[PDB]
């Protein structure tokens, strides 16, 4: 059966090379590159007393939630730097957080293998754990709400899961990864999502049927970050081999490679600008770089973090970038 | 500011105050990463003192946090950076493992990885040698050659245990990191005293290094 699997893999390789007419670099040799995309730290969010592992913007592009090792989930008013909530976590070992698209819920998880859904908008004025989603047998590396009731989580047990939060039960389990799934990104329409794992492969998952539509293998090392292009027909992955790759869903192969000879450190987080021409990747060299996602040119740099930039996100209105880091600060960039 | 913005700022300042108080309280906690290899004597010392087991207890005006993380049956490097700020690693090694296939060679490889990890350059290790009584029962009959063909030493209990322990300190290869080995028989209710002594020595050595006196 291994022979048949290898034959099918070779057939997929031949099909991918068949569709490789002109590389993204050849078709974007004539577009005018943006010279130096220079964001500047507008707000610095202080109040985390440990390394920050995750942050997630609100859909209102003003509130953001940050997860840190000090056992606190803090909701920030990024405009005024006001702390809207400070949620004490039962497990301090949180390495992911998600903010519900409605804003009524926030999720967190990590080494406790449990996704904790927090009801922000309660009749009481406190934030309480509405639902603890247990069932993953590894640490949760990412979680992403589809809506108030559906959340997709990725775990170190090599499986992504879809949860019905009201019942607390896994609606679907997305098996097929061989290494620890490290990140998720839902499509803008949230009908399907990509997940990067330690097997250096990003898989495209259909939410309803639970079937892996496509598998993308371009990286040499552990994929730490993944993010759809704004139109949902492509995505970008960030792996430990210091390179980002732009895979197309329809083309089913990498289109562009975002690597620089000065960069040898791994990539913790990636995100796109609202138009998608910028690919903001957070690196282990303590700063975030900005990439011309169409020309692979390093458009700019986001320096200002004294430790590894573990997470970064762009507002749904594309106005600002928040980059958390292990130095316990979130900086808002414009 | 508006009246509502003023009250929101007041709430934010209250949140900041509570965060600072919680950080002050958490800074007084001595964080220990409790490791081991499969069937090692981790559970015995756990009783003496899901995905991660966190144990809080106070000993001699010191509040310890034991992070038992062996249940994480995945790649360690994907979660070992969470414990970058641990005071020490309480490594458990079953002495009665040289005769079981190899268990203790896997423990030695894990110990080498823990010592040479980029996040544990200056993080001390409180090595515990577990089940030393069964090791003594098994060491008189079977010699210490299955685990160490290069042993070439006396078949005695003390020499065999010292050889295993010394092979363990051999992986330290660091000036700012020390290994505080102890021998345990699973029937001694003073292992937390050994952990406390090791942690006290760790704090004293860190303070001396800050003073330039170490």
């Amino acid at each position: 059966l291994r022979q048949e699997a290898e034959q099918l893999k070779n057939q997929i390789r031949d099909a991918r090379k068949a569709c490789a007419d002109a590389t993204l670099s050849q078709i974007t040799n004539n577009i005018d590159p943006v010279g130096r995309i220079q964001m500047r730290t507008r707000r610095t969010l202080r109040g985390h007393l440990a390394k920050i592992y995750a942050m997630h913007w609100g859909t209102d592009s003003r509130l953001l939630v940050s997860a840190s090792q000090d056992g606190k989930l803090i909701i920030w008013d990024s405009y005024t730097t006001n702390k809207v909530h400070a949620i004490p976590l039962r497990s301090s070992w949180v390495m992911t957080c998600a903010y519900a698209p409605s804003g009524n819920y926030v999720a967190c998880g990590g080494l406790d293998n449990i996704c904790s859904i927090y009801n922000l908008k309660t009749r009481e004025g406190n934030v309480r754990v509405s639902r603890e989603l247990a069932g993953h047998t590894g640490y949760l590396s990412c979680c992403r709400f589809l809506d108030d009731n559906q959340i997709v989580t990725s775990s170190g047990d090599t499986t992504c899961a879809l949860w019905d939060i009201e019942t607390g039960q896994q609606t679907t389990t997305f098996t097929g990864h061989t290494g620890d799934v490290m990140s998720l990104s839902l499509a803008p329409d949230t009908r399907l999502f990509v997940s990067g794992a330690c097997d250096a492969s990003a898989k495209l998952w259909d939410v309803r049927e639970g079937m892996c539509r496509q598998t993308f293998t371009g990286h040499e090392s552990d994929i730490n970050a993944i993010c759809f292009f704004p139109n949902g027909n492509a995505f970008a992955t960030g792996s430990d081999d210091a390179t980002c790759r732009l895979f197309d869903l329809r083309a089913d192969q990498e289109l562009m490679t975002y690597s620089h000879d000065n960069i040898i450190c791994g990539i913790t987080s990636v995100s796109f600008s609202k138009s998608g021409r910028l690919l903001l990747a957070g690196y282990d060299d303590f700063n975030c770089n900005v990439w011309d996602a169409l020309k692979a040119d390093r458009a700019g740099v986001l320096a200002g973090h004294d430790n590894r930039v573990s997470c970064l996100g762009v507002t749904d209105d594309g106005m600002a970038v928040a980059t958390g880091s292990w130095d316990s600060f979130l900086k808002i960039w414009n | 500011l508006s009246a509502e913005e003023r009250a929101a700022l007041e709430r934010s300042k209250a949140i900041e105050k509570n965060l600072k108080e919680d950080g002050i309280s958490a800074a007084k906690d001595v964080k220990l990463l409790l490791l081991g290899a499969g069937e090692s004597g981790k559970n015995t010392i756990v009783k003496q003192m899901t995905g991660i087991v966190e144990t809080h207890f106070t000993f001699k005006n010191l509040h310890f946090r034991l992070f038992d993380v062996g249940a994480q049956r995945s790649e360690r490097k994907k979660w070992i950076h969470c414990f970058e700020d641990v005071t020490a690693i309480i490594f458990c090694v079953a002495l009665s493992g040289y005769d079981q296939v190899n268990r203790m060679h896997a423990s030695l490889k894990l110990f080498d990885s823990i010592c040479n990890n980029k996040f544990f350059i200056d993080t001390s290790i409180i090595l515990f040698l577990n089940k030393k009584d069964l090791f003594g029962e098994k060491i008189k009959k079977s010699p210490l050659t299955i685990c160490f063909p290069e042993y070439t030493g006396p078949n005695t209990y003390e020499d065999a245990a010292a050889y295993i322990q010394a092979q363990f300190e051999s992986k330290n290869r660091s000036p700012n990191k020390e290994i505080y080995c102890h021998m345990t028989c699973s029937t001694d209710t003073n292992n937390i005293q050994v952990v406390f002594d090791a942690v006290t020595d760790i704090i004293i050595a860190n303070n001396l290094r800050g003073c330039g006196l170490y």
Partner: single-chain antibody, 232 residues
Framework: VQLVESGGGLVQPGGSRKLSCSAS????????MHWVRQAPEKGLEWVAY????????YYADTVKGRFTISRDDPKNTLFLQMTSLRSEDTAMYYC??????????????WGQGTTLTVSSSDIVMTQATSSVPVTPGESVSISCRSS???????????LYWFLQRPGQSPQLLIY???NLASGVPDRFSGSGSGTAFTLTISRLEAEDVGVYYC?????????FGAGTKLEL
């Protein structure tokens, strides 16, 4: 969630009493609590405010000095220390639950109120309409006027709408102008700009009969408009 006021009763003029609020069912420590009184025939009138943790306190300019608002978080009790009780201090005193952050809904829960009987620059909120006849099933608009623009430099308009249903304490309808309160059916709608506002009800029910109050929360001496009663 319930707020129970105790005390009130009958007091001689110039006397003194303490009003108590036995808050229960919610995280009382995190709420800025108000005292809002309503004269036996008049409309609501905000009395005092003690923030979360007692850090910030305001009083109505007509009760300042005579009244003292205090809270007891461990026992979740809110106090109004009333002294020199003039004849104009007779009213039903409502304790009001209010929490302030981004997106919060202040004034959302009102205590049932306690009756006090005493023997014998501020923004002006105007409700020119009052006691308007309405019929079930038809749309009605309740208007409001403000002396100062309630819209702030941040883009937020601090206009509140409450419903003094007959025999029931006020219940929030729209907390910031055009922001429906929790549990309020989506037929009430708020709109306006600057100083002029309107509360629109799509298909008014039999439960929509009551008295509708404005409130500004821009400058802190919070002022209500004289209620615009709805009757069949």
């Amino acid at each position: 969630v319930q707020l129970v006021e105790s005390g009130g009763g009958l007091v001689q003029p110039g006397g003194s009493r303490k009003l108590s609020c036995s808050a229960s069912g919610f995280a009382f420590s995190s709420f800025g609590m108000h005292w809002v009184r309503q004269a036996p025939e008049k409309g609501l009138e905000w009395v005092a405010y003690i923030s979360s943790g007692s850090g910030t306190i305001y009083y109505a300019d007509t009760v300042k000095g005579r009244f003292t608002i205090s809270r007891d978080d461990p026992k979740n009790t809110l106090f109004l220390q009333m002294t020199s009780l003039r004849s104009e201090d007779t009213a039903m005193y409502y304790c009001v639950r209010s929490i302030y952050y981004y997106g919060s809904s202040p004034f959302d829960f009102w205590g049932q109120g306690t009756t006090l009987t005493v023997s014998s620059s501020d923004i002006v909120m105007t409700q020119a309409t009052s006691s308007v006849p309405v019929t079930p099933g038809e749309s009605v608009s309740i208007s409001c006027r403000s002396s100062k623009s309630l819209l702030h430099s941040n883009g937020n308009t601090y206009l509140y709408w409450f419903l003094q249903r007959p025999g029931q304490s006020p219940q929030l309808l729209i907390y910031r102008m055009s922001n429906l309160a929790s549990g309020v059916p989506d037929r009430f709608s708020g709109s306006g700009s600057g100083t002029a506002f309107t509360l629109t009800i799509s298909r008014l029910e039999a439960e929509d009969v009551g008295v509708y109050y404005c409130m500004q929360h821009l400058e802190y001496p919070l002022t209500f408009g004289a209620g615009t009663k709805l009757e069949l």
